[PDB]
């Protein structure tokens, strides 16, 4: 219901382009039903419609030698269509079957040179002499009139959509040389395929925009109100202007970019002129877009704004935005990094109300971005982008370009032995036999400082239930509070119950109090914001109410969140605790959490989970109906959960065959969920030791017979190999002593025994 | 060695298994017992940088601003990997606040807390190893002796017989000594 | 090249970052990898940074243009901004150039120091020129400051001063090289 | 939230209740504004408000007895379709 | 050849500084096969390599009286090659 907007809406004439074995540009390969479906009269001209209206046409003939949904052309028409193989084009005869009147060609020097001759006699008469080789007005095409690729430009043409150029078309031969890179200047018009890490945040743009531009009639006549301001924001460098250009050029809308600092880099009383002349031709041309880039540089908060000539640009921007009326059909979108930095007067209604949120790309966004950036490099076989995408943690949609850059430079540096320092004779195989390995990528990854390691990460976790096992009751009582009020809302209206808005875990430290939150967040495909202890205790050592509001506002825009306030008691135990001083738990921060937990509508699906190592010293003000209401007690792992934890820790490392985890978990009784992760690491540092010792001992050994030539055994220790756990179990420490697990059992038993109405039975 | 050298000289072995490198140690022992000469000695082996972070300067942060320099100290080591950042006298704030302060304050002290924020926000790929050193290994905040942070404790005992011979021959290097001095004897009574 | 001492560790990084983009323009444009749009050296004042820029550019065959800090911020309000333009305009005309904007923490301080309006109109005039650079111009700007956070944070955004070397205090064996450079004219006695 | 008979000594004034007093006195009775408090610890409340001219009397709201419980149950069970054979007159008679 | 660009191409005919007692400012004392390797004929001038493009060239004669490892030169060219005795100098003909 949310991301159903990218439907393709196929038409019968959609055929996937393919390669043609003939240099002829006017070859069409059709399915037999396609020839007689659109009544394709042989010899005429059919209109081929690509994307960005990048188009080039062909004569339709009886050539069905290819597949049913493929069409064969050469590089001229296909490349002028600017769509690869895997993109369909509606082959459809538009009745503009006409010849051009006058065309002007712009030759490109390197393509034209070699065989040059005269433009007309060699390339324009015979290559267009009744040969039915058609071209589109205003293109940059390819002429196979010589020994190799020769490219021109279409400038003037009587049939604007498409035409065949004939000798009747008088062509001026004063064409000037053009460049191969000059095509890239125009092709800086980005397609829609070049955005990664924004599978979700681009559906919102496709629904807010792309409807009120492709059909002004619909939304204008029905009386609905289209947006007049979108405020994209995220960490710096996630490529937001790229998003704006994609959304604009993809829907045939003029895109006018207003630079951020380029406004105030000008004289007093001159920047206002630029804002006016931008908003006054954007309204002039067409359904347009203004992308006011780097907005927080021309409209800060009041405090950073100092003079008056700078609080005049802001007011000019405001009076220009309120000059937008429904006739104009213009849509403004800005780009700050956080919503706070912008001037608060702009967020008022009618100016910048709706507010999309680009964010740090997630575990698959990085993969897809890497695939975008590495479609030009020549990757070696052993490169596994799905692997490196898992490594890069804090990187954004810009650091990955630099990572690719560093890897390519690492290869070009390992270009070492046998090409001279000034060897301009760099063989083409140097540019086409590059082999970037995992070595280069790991080298680059070890050198890049990530841009945004200090941002909260809002992404669905990748844990499952069988990484904990057991907990068969907490499982259901945590389902009934995060899954039912999401997947089956109508039940909660059929009856009268209001969904709860919190749960408070409590138990010994290190027992799976985080894996449960992550697991339940995974279950209902819900984002997972985690707020650890230090990130709160820092608030208690200075300001409050300036970040907690931010945390909840961040959670609101990612419904359904499962906010996990780990170590709620942290302040209470860092302020003495159970002795402390004069205080009724009296916290500067927790009170703010209460204030924001009341002013929160239940309809938004933001469930708050706490976790306290101590269930009593906490403030009693939260354990009151309307807030975190009931306490779940997370016991120590008992039998199945220990097997599951061991098999989830030992899933990354090669284990032997006789390693009896079903016995190892059967022996270790009172072990935490984080003391079975040091019978599983300290059992690996006894293998790293042994392998890295055997290697060195073998290396020193074989210098006794350096001429043996029979050395380098494939593996001395390939395997964790039981009799390591025999030793690693000698440093296994029980974290929670039996004198400290009493304090929780003798609490949970006290929650009971205050219950049990038992013999209660309604009469008759 | 297995904490500063192996995760540097043989990083490929750490991928064959799934082990993740440790990012901390905590020496503790009687005061003035070569707890600093062990940070330098290992830093000399793997040819690593060595940023030394003393007591009288951490305690400066607790007497004013914090949390604006601890961020920078780490970001200095990140641009100079592989470091062996050595937070000398991690307890310095704790015993300068009361040593189980009377008013109640348990562990958090506005500076040791800040180290936790940076220590967690540091990917293990960068080869930065944090080494503490304390003489009061009980008042140290229990929030750092937890997995993911400074993990274990190594107890540096007093020099016994063989180090004392070597310690003497290190101090008596620049000074022309007589040839009939018996450091093998002088190190056998000093016990 | 050999008139710089104590920087052999960092001067290697400038080797990888600059000469390869400058002495082999086609290879970068052919493969498509992108050279840096600006280096940002930083270190304590007087470590000979305005020499390193000359070192790199005077031996790689590349025109060098020096923009001083106080030279810009001491002209008539509205005339300084012109001088910045007539530097980037002139350099782009010439060969692969190196603009070394020395004393950058003077023409672009933290906002918390900028108070005048003309004081914040040079900074914007700098940013538009910087991001105005693209692969055609083949220019590589590089700056100098004493401490990285003493610069306007709007400059470190991607595309302006992305990568950032760190010249540091010379080490115990670096000084021996410097002393052998400043005393190659003196008549030292044999002792 | 200050100590409940704080140890350092502070008796009644707390910088906020004092302001409530200052505003409460400076408000003519002609305006028809009635100030209702509510506390669960009716001894630590500042003795400077239980004085004539300010919040004067105290009313002790007891636990629901037998009829208020029936009404409370029938008020909570209004939006949820209930069975017709449920005896709230019994469920309110056992819960005591 | 896709791992190769860092070559400096040290040459078999690289000539190291050797002192001379002559006063002619363009006389070069070369190895015997110097005229022979690149088939360096008489009547041209070589392009001696210094630094910073600050070089100084000579007229190359069939004067191969030196040894096969070094070049004997006066102060003029080697110093006007802006390189002290101790800098690499490479020999290469220039048809200019």
Author numbering:
A (entry chain A): 12 to 775
B (entry chain F): 490 to 680
C (entry chain F): 203 to 393
D (entry chain B): 585 to 680
E (entry chain F): 12 to 107
Sentences from the paper on this structure:
P97/VCP is an ATP‐dependent unfoldase that forms a homo‐hexamer machinery extracting ubiquitinated or non‐ubiquitinated proteins from macromolecular complexes, membranes, and misfolded protein aggregates for subsequent degradation or remodeling. VCPIP1, first identified as P97/VCP interacting protein, is a multi‐domain containing deubiquitinase (DUB), which harbors an N‐terminal OTU domain, a middle UFD1 domain, and the C‐terminal UBL domain. VCPIP1(VCP135, Valosin‐Containing Protein‐Interacting Protein, p135), a P97/VCP‐P47 complex interacting protein, is strictly required for both ER and Golgi membrane fusion processes regulated by P97/VCP‐P47. The VCPIP1‐P97/VCP (Valosin‐Containing Protein) complex is required for post‐mitotic Golgi cisternae reassembly and maintenance in interphase.
To elucidate the structure basis of the VCPIP1 and P97/VCP interaction, we reconstituted the complex by size exclusion chromatography and determined the structure of the VCPIP1‐P97/VCP complex using single‐particle Cryo‐EM. We finally obtained a 3D reconstruction at an overall resolution of 3.45 Å. Unexpectedly, three VCPIP1 molecules directly bind to the C‐terminal D2 ATPase domain of the P97/VCP, resulting in the formation of P97/VCP‐VCPIP1 complex with a stoichiometry of 2:1. VCPIP1 interacts simultaneously with two adjacent P97/VCP protomers through its UFD1 domain, and no other region of VCPIP1 was found to have contact with P97/VCP in our structure, in contrast to the previous prediction which suggested the C‐terminal UBL domain of VCPIP1 is responsible for P97/VCP binding. The partial UFD1 domain of VCPIP1 observed in the cryo‐EM structure folded into 4 β‐strands and 2 α‐helices. The residues on the αA and αB of the UFD1 domain of VCPIP1 form extensive hydrophobic and hydrophilic interactions with the residues on the α9 and β4‐β5 loop of the D2 domains from two adjacent P97/VCP protomers. Moreover, the aromatic residue Y623 plays a pivotal role in mediating the complex formation in interface 1, the side chain of Y623 pointed into the hydrophobic pocket formed by the side chains of P626, K754, M757, and F758 from the α9 and β4‐β5 loop of the D2 domain in P97/VCP. The aromatic side chain of F638 inserts into a hydrophobic pocket formed by residues R625, P626, Y755, and F758 from the β4‐β5 loop and α9 of the D2 domain, resulting in extensive hydrophobic interactions. However, in the VCPIP1‐P97/VCP complex structure, all P97/VCP molecules are in “UP” conformation without ATP being added to the solution. Furthermore, no nucleotide density was observed in the nucleotide‐binding pockets of both the D1 and D2 ATPase domains of P97/VCP.
